[PDB]
Each structure stands twice: as structure tokens, then as C-alpha cells.
Amino acid sequence: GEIEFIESSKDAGFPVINTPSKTKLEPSVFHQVFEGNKEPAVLRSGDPRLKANFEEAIFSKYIGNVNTHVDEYMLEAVDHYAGQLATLDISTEPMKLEDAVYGTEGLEALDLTTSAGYPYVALGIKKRDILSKKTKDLTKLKECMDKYGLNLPMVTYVKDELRSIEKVAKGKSRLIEASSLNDSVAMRQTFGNLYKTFHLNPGVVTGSAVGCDPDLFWSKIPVMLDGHLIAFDYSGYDASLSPVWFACLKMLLEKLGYTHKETNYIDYLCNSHHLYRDKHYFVRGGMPSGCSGTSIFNSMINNIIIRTLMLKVYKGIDLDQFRMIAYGDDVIASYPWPIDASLLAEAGKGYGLIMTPADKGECFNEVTWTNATFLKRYFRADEQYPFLVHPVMPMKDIHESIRWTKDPKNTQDHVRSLCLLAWHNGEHEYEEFIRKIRSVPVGRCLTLPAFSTLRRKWLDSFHHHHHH
């Protein structure tokens, strides 16, 4: 991805986006109880913790584009992955407006708490001023869609979230795009059935984990990925995507039955128009993280990429024996024979991708079930029921999270969520977590689950059939 044109918003009539410059994250009541090194990401140029130029850092992931045609390797990769998706019978029929907006099986209701994007943010019009959970009203939305139309600019925000000491110092804060409510809606109508099918079918057929429930999904992963594991990381995946990968994504959707006109929304994601504060700019390539379906599309593209690299490096590869599960850039895969990921990384580099060893490793080492992580979680077989696998979020991560809050009024939900993550670390670690939480008065005002209850409910969850 690359920035192709920048201008002062006022020269083109756009008002300045008044995006918050102060973090909503504050130290929580548990900040002193637990240890941690993460702090809120830098959100403004003047941050005294900066040790690099902010604006440069944030836009630096737009490393450029490789200007290539869709090659032979890509074509076979698309064909192989389209073959899997075909077995899913994804309907390319538009999703009915109400289903797209207010919720349906496999596609949660449009989040009414996130930004409505442009022009709404400039007019003080919030999603809630247009939409109604209670009434499922669509009259106002339609007025809005007709009045303002589609293909509106995206609003660029700096993601307000915890980051490592090093990422704070380097101003390496993440940018997310707020698609206009009009474009979000039109995209959910166009691809909603694909979103639903993906959400209902995490695994090796969609090659996606988007929308999965790790508590349940983890036990399936080693059944699905039964060869020698393959895993590696990308650096700035989203912004590194060149247009060629979107071209591949468009071919893939066409094989699925989408018309050329329907894939036009992919051009909207690729060659994009943004507002960042007082600037207005155009980008060619790069997935604009935050728009409708970005995790799904990123995941689909990853399926094309990895197959492409294997086909390129290993001419004798048999893709029918390759398996992978992606969540955007995050991947866990397997092949029955050992595969040299450093080789795949060099191939990727020729395609404008930056792949590094898994988990900040120095060498493309062997990935084992002991060291493998996915969605930041390790895999640990239950001691009593070996076929059940615990998703293990490191206690360090749980500690980082508990020390800060964006709204202390949600302490109960926040802590409960962390408890659902923590117990997988074991009874001793859990009792210690709980003891430390209760070492401050707020901790004793909370309804915290008992370990035995967590374990029991986890074991019972595997009893209830799940719709696919």
C-alpha cells in the first residue's frame, strides 16, 4: 500500500476531523496490584514519551506496492482456495437490509457504538441517531443512504489501545479506518452471506478463524492441522498488501459467483480516500483495517498468499495436503512434510510482504504444539480429557489488560472476561489471579467465577450441538 496524494482538507471543502488526542485509557484500581509494561499508544505528535516522529511512524506501514500482474502461482492459488470455498455454497444474493443492519444468524448487528464515519461525524450525527435496536427502523438509514450515497471517504483514527514500551517510544500506533455508515451497510448487503458463512464455519475449509470462540475452537485445530506445523508473523500486513493481492481477491470472488460490479467494493478498499484530522489523502493498495469485512478479506487474501508462496518455492507441493487457518494476518498451518518458512519469507518479500519468524523469534525455528500461538494463545491439552485443548492466554497479557481501563463503570465485565481467559492457565495461577484481584476492595465487590464453575461449564459446552 502507498499514499499517492495528500492535501489540506480545507482546500477541498472537508472540515477537520476532530479526533480525540487524549487516551481514554487510565490506570485501573488494579494497576498497582499487578505488573506490566504496556501503556496507552501515542495518539498525538506532542506526546512526551515519543522518541521518534509520530506522523512518520503511523504512516510508515505504507511501504509501497510491487507493480506486478497476477502471476501463474497466484492463479493456481486462487483456483485451489476457490475449490474449497465452493463446497460451502456461499450465496452471492444480497443480504436483506434488516438482516445486514440489525443482526441475523452468523452476522451480529451493526455495532451502534462505533463511528458512523463521514459525513456524519462532521454533522454530529451518531449511528444511534439513525438506527434503532428497539424499532429496527430503516427509514432514516435509507434517507441517509440516498442523500449521501456511496464511496464516501474513510475517516482515519489512531487506535487507542495498550502498546509495548518500544512501540510507544517509536510512535508505532495503529491506524484504523471508519468506513461511512453508508458504505458499511452496502458492503454488508453485498457480502453479508459470505460473512455469515465464514463466521459459521471457522476452520480449514474457509481457512478462517474470524468469529471463532477459542474455548470451543482450540480443540478442533489440532484435529484439522495434523502435519508439521507452519507459522510465521507478518510486519504491517494490512498496509503492505499491494493491489495485485486485491486483484487476486476479486478473481476469487468472481469464481464464487459475484459479478464484476459486486467486486467493485474491493476497489473501494484497495484504492481508497481518507480524512485524517486536517488532511485528505488517497492510498493505492493496503487493506484499510476497520472497514466492513476487513478481517475476512485479509484472511481470504492470506489464503491466496501462502498458497502462492508454497507453489512458487515448492514446485512439487501438493496443496490438497496443505491446511491453514488465518485470522487476518495471523496464521497457523500445516503440511505433511517439513517446510522452510525462511524460504517462503523471501518469496513473500518479492511480493512486497514482510514475514518474520513466529513470535518475535530470531530464526524460522521449528513450530511445535508447545510453542505455537494463534490469537496470542498457546495450546495445552487438558490433563483429564486429552482430546480437549485449552486456549492459553499468557498471564502476562491478562495482567497488562487488567491494569488499565477506558471506563471503570465496566469493571465487572472487564474482569469477568479476563477470568474466562485466565483459568485456562491452571488452578494455582487462577487462585493467585483471584487473590490479587481481591487484594483491593473493588475486587471483593465483584462476582468472580469459581474455578470449578469455569471448568464445569467449559466441559459441558462441548455437549451442545453447534449450527454450521
Partner: peptide, 9 residues
């Protein structure tokens, strides 16, 4: 996979 007792996190 590894079991918790055999491997920690």
C-alpha cells in the same frame, strides 16, 4: 498438543 503439566506458558 502439550499438556499444561508438561509445558507451561
Amino acid at each position: 498438543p502439550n499438556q499444561k503439566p508438561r509445558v507451561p506458558t
